[PDB]
Nucleic acid binder design. Structure first.
Ligand SMILES: [Mg+2]
Ligand SMILES: [Mg+2]
Ligand SMILES: [Mg+2]
Ligand SMILES: [Mg+2]
Ligand SMILES: [Mg+2]
Ligand SMILES: [Mg+2]
Ligand SMILES: [Mg+2]
Ligand SMILES: [Mg+2]
Ligand SMILES: [Mg+2]
Ligand SMILES: [Mg+2]
Ligand SMILES: [Mg+2]
Ligand SMILES: [Mg+2]
Ligand SMILES: [Mg+2]
Ligand SMILES: [Mg+2]
Ligand SMILES: [Mg+2]
Ligand SMILES: [Mg+2]
Ligand SMILES: [Mg+2]
Ligand SMILES: [Mg+2]
Ligand SMILES: [Mg+2]
Lengths: 61, 202, 160, 98, 147, 38, 197
RNA sequence: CACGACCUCAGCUCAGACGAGAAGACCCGCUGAAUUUAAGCAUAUUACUAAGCGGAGGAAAAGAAACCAACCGGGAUUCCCCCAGUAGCGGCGAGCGAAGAGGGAAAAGUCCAGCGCCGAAUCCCCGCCCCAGGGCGAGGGACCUGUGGCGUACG
RNA sequence: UGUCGGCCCCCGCCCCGCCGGGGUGCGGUUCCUCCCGGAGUCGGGUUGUUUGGGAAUGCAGCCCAAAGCGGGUGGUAAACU
RNA sequence: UUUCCUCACUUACCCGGUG
């Protein structure tokens, strides 16, 4: 557990890390869209979500 | 120009298309059964079915043996009642185009089938082109209008009756024509109409 | 199989009226099993102050003043062991019933009469027949609150 | 004197009709000047089908009954046979006018 | 319950109430409604005459909402209004007559079965019978229609 | 054959690398951090 | 099988029905599951009504339900334009909109426009940010008098139509009711055969 | 290929990724019987079931009308009650058998191709600079056999 | 056990607030002009299967093979409206 | 523009031979 901490500090910032140093959550999670790819919002629904977003309202009775 | 292409491909009996469908069907039957095409033979039809010029979109030509289904029984002996003595005039319950896309999406497991279309005909074979998508290419995962196919629920969508060519055989729709599949599939409707709903206060 | 049986809503109310009418006769309550030979009055109506009780010591003292503690001493002497294979199925200890208490506002009445064995508390608006007529027999000794007694004429209504 | 009956020619509850603009989906399948220009161009590039070519050969010999029975056998429904024969007769008459 | 059952009083009797000569077996006369024309003909032709055969035309797409036409009689006609309303206009028959809208009460056609009290009354129904309007005109009142 | 499937189904053996997934799921597959030291 | 006078029974128990039997033992627990979902949803949309957007009032098609009104799905684009509300703005202020429904009459059109007018009067709008209130945002005082409306938004008032007792005129008594209906059925049958004459 | 471009097609233990198997109660696509019933039996029934094959998810499938209706008209899908053992199918024998309306649970709608304006305004890879989020490179490509923006039957 | 009791160590959620990096205005227009769509597909014949769907309810094979005031449906085959 | 039959053309299709 000492040589792995040195390797994790060595591959810190590297685009390509060894397979054993990558997060092993499960085979289904590793093939999901990352936070960057799922937050991508196309230029059409960016304008639609800007001026047609549901507002906070209330009804008297 | 795509307007002039979809209207030209409707004159399949004219001298221009009858010659092209004669030379290409000859060329298609000289190659293998599953042969990747470098580009869509019908660019107008591909775009119409969801194809783009991005990286990760591939096209495969599939040659399927056209004709009905012969029941695989030894020496044509279906041991049973004369209702099921038919071996010859038996038709597959799924489209022949749906067989071409299932045959292409299985050989390429790492890709998801999008759609397929008709490119050639013959007396023995039918030729199609299957549009597949590499759901792990960055040009496809970084497009919000294409991330829907990268989900795990679309795994092998062409062999569950989800593509346009295979969804027709399920016989679903809206209206008096399609009462058999009210509830999704015909087996979901059949299961609901046969469950004995034993209420708690009946 | 048909575990559940539904009864007519009018027959559920008829059975409730006949169960409340039996809680007003000295015969049907004493013959039910409750020891009320020293209570001041058979329909035991108490002030609405009892709805504000929040400690069991305030609740046990009232039952000793109204001479209803003898009905609870019967519950202590009845605590025994069930006969048969019912002890292996979370029904080991069995006992007897006590004076039911009908209230109107739950300002602490339910928690003040919790730890007393046999006490069954029920709102005046929602009266369960299974607790007001235990075992199918009528004559449950009910202790009424003044607030519950006023609303009782509005729940079912007079004949007029 | 006269009440709205529930049976007859003037059947139904009496209400004032609110006529508005038709749905835009009902213009589907209407020939535009560009759709006509595109199809009339490919008609001279491609030509006529083998069954349309031998059906116009029956119109010039004034066999419109045998022409319709031939087109009705090819295209199917009788409604599509009249429009196809009229389209071939309009093309055959324009060819003669040239 | 089982304590009130019959099998509780058949313990000890061998055949269990099904005879010794003809023992209780599994379907001795066919399952269901079998033999309705061969060996149960005497039963079907005596208690269910008309069971076999066809009669009438076939209505393919029958929608029960189209043939919906609930009827009401003249005897129960005044049930659609209050009892006080029937008396407040019974004393003053000088022309003010209550309007009974049978359509807004859930019925369509009015039939003249019972007797009608001699009071002027206006009825609104989609359909009237011949004798239904004759008894209303004779008692006094109109029979207006509603679509 | 329900008995033949019951003898060799998932769970009749050890589940070495699967019993760990069951334990890591109840915490959200937490990886990369360490508990607070003394 | 039959013994004496009785019905000819047809119990459809010839399939393997025992493998498809749904028992309603989770029915009471499903009420708690549905109710806790309404309470959880209510807190998520706390200032907004819990029943949902404003539903219109429509008529039932068949003659069996000819006279009954019913809450439809959404308001027609013609009913929104008659009240000044835009198509896509109505989705933001909780007004249901559907583009398939049409208005074949004026009585149904004005019934929904007046239903849509009084809603915007009872509709309280919170500004997008409390720092700067915009034009369409409601005043600062009535924002304090806001609450989550429980139950359906503006439930349909099935007003009972009662006609005043009128004097039966002589023209009204001379109306042959049975003859009018009996003639209306004969004209509709002989209408086509008379057009050829 | 004398020297290049392209098209089409190959090779690698080429740089980086992906597919396989398991499980399979529920779910989706095919395939598919006979015991049994008809007091025999061949159509029918059993049954568009068991077994067999392929493919998934925490739900799946379905889904924003080439719908229902024939009315004063309803308005995606799914589920429950009802419609209803009804219309109807059937050696019209045994048997089989939905749907519109209506009352409820939940409700959310939308994107392309095509049409054609915008100097390909678009995308991936590589080498980097700043604090998951933004820029740079007279780097290498993809692409005019069409990327991106506006826009889809409600115009 | 009862007390939504008390305390401690992790972590999550919506809204509000200012600071910091990227977003670009939207509607009304009985006003003008332009554009407006998915072929071996629909449909027809035939065959097998399926359905309560019955002179076809769905699906599929082979053959024929479209139109653009067009096309589909309107539970009886067929022509006109 | 045509149907029947016959003879020809080779590029569809089919068979054989070869490193
Ligand atoms: Mg776009
Ligand atoms: Mg014992
Ligand atoms: Mg005896
Ligand atoms: Mg015996
Ligand atoms: Mg016997
Ligand atoms: Mg004998
Ligand atoms: Mg028996
Ligand atoms: Mg007998
Ligand atoms: Mg006898
Ligand atoms: Mg697998
Ligand atoms: Mg038999
Ligand atoms: Mg037998
Ligand atoms: Mg199976
Ligand atoms: Mg769920
Ligand atoms: Mg899904
Ligand atoms: Mg509907
Ligand atoms: Mg009934
Ligand atoms: Mg069946
Ligand atoms: Mg069948």
């Amino acid at each position: 557990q000492t040589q792995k901490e040195n390797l994790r500090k060595f591959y810190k910032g590297k685009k390509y890390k060894p397979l054993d140093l990558r997060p092993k959550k499960t085979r289904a999670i590793r093939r999901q869209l990352t936070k960057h790819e799922e937050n991508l919002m196309t230029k059409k629904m960016q304008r639609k979500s800007r001026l047609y977003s549901i507002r906070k309202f209330a009804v008297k009775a | 120009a795509y307007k002039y292409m979809q209207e030209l491909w409707r004159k399949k009996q004219s001298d221009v298309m009858r010659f092209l469908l004669r030379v290409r069907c000859w060329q298609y039957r000289q190659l293998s059964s599953l042969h990747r095409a470098p580009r869509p033979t019908r660019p107008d039809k591909a775009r119409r079915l969801g194809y783009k010029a991005k990286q990760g979109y591939v096209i495969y030509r599939i040659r399927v043996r056209r004709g009905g289904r012969k029941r695989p029984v030894p020496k044509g002996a279906t041991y049973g009642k004369p209702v099921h003595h038919g071996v010859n005039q038996i038709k597959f319950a799924r489209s022949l185009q749906s067989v071409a896309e299932e045959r292409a999406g299985r050989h390429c497991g790492g890709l998801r089938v999008l759609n397929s279309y008709w490119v050639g005909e013959d007396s023995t074979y039918k030729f199609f082109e299957v549009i597949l998508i590499d759901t792990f290419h960055k040009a496809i995962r970084r497009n919000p209008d294409t991330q829907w196919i990268t989900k795990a629920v679309h795994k092998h969508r062409e062999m569950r009756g989800l593509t346009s060519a295979g969804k027709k055989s399920r016989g679903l729709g809206k209206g008096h024509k399609f009462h058999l599949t009210i509830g999704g599939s015909r087996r979901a409707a059949w299961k609901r109409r046969n469950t004995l709903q034993l209420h708690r206060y009946r | 199989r048909r575990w559940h049986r539904r009864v007519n809503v009018n027959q559920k109310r008829y059975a409730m009226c006949s169960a409340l009418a039996a809680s007003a006769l000295p015969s049907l309550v004493m013959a039910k099993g409750h020891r009320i030979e020293e209570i001041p009055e058979v329909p035991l109506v108490v002030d609405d102050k009892v709805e504000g009780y929040k400690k069991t010591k305030e609740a046990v003292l009232l039952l000793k003043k109204l001479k209803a503690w003898n009905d609870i001493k019967k519950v202590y002497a009845s605590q025994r062991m069930r006969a048969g294979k019912g002890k292996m199925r979370n029904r080991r200890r069995i006992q007897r019933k006590g004076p039911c208490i009908i209230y109107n506002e739950d300002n602490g009445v339910t928690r003040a009469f919790r730890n007393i064995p046999g006490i069954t508390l029920q709102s005046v608006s929602r009266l369960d027949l299974l607790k007001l007529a235990p075992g199918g027999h009528i004559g449950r000794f009910c202790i009424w609150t003044e607030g519950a007694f006023r609303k009782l004429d509005d729940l079912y209504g007079t004949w007029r | 004197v006269r009440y709205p009956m529930a049976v007859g020619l003037n059947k139904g509850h009496k209400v004032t009709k609110n006529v508005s603009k038709p749905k835009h989906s009902r213009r589907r399948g209407r020939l535009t000047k560009h759709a006509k220009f595109a199809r009339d161009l490919i008609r001279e590039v491609c030509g006529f089908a083998p069954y349309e070519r031998r059906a116009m050969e029956l119109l010039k010999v004034s066999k419109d009954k045998r022409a319709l029975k031939f087109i009705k056998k090819r295209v199917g429904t009788h409604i599509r046979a009249k429009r196809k024969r009229e389209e071939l007769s309009n093309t055959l008459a324009a060819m003669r006018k040239a | 319950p089982t304590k009130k059952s019959k099998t509780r009083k058949l313990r000890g009797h061998v055949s269990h109430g099904h005879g010794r000569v003809g023992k209780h077996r599994k379907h001795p006369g066919g399952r269901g409604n079998a033999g309705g024309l061969h060996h149960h003909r005497i039963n079907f032709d005596k208690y269910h005459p008309g069971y076999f055969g066809k009669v009438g035309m076939r209505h393919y797409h029958l929608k029960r909402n189209t043939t919906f036409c609930p009827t009401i009689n003249l005897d129960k006609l005044w049930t659609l209004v209050s009892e006080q309303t029937r008396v407040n206009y019974s004393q003053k028959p000088d022309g003010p007559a209550p309007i009974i809208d049978v359509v807004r009460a859930g019925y369509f056609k009015v039939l003249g079965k019972g007797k009608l009290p001699k009071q002027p009354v206006i009825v609104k129904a989609k359909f009237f019978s011949r004798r239904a309007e004759e008894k209303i005109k004779g008692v006094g009142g109109a029979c207006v229609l509603t679509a | 054959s329900a008995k033949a499937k019951r003898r060799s189904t998932t769970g009749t053996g050890r589940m070495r690398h699967m019993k760990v997934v069951f334990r890591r799921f109840r915490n959200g597959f937490r990886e990369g951090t360490v508990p607070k030291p003394r | 099988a039959p013994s004496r006078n009785g019905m000819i029974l047809n119990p459809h128990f010839h399939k393997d029905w025992q493998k498809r039997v749904r028992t309603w033992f989770n029915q009471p627990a499903r009420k708690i599951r549905r109710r806790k979902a309404r309470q959880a949803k209510a807190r998520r949309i706390a200032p907004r009504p819990v029943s949902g957007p404003l539903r219109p009032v429509v008529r039932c098609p068949t003659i069996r339900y000819h006279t009954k009104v019913r809450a439809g799905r959404g308001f027609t684009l013609e009913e929104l334009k008659a009240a000044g509300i835009n198509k896509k703005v109505a989705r933001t202020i909780g007004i249901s909109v559907d583009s398939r429904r049409r208005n074949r009459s004026t009585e149904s059109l004005q019934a929904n426009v007046q239903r849509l007018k009084e809603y915007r009067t009872k509709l309280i709008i919170f500004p997008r940010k409390a720092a700067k209130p915009k034009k369409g945002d409601s005043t600062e005082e009535e924002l304090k008098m806001a609450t989550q409306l429980t139950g359906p938004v503006m439930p349909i008032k099935k007003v009972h139509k009662k006609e005043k007792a009128r004097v039966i005129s002589e023209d009204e008594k001379n109306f042959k009711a049975f003859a009018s209906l009996r003639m209306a059925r004969a004209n509709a049958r002989l209408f086509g055969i008379r057009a050829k004459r």
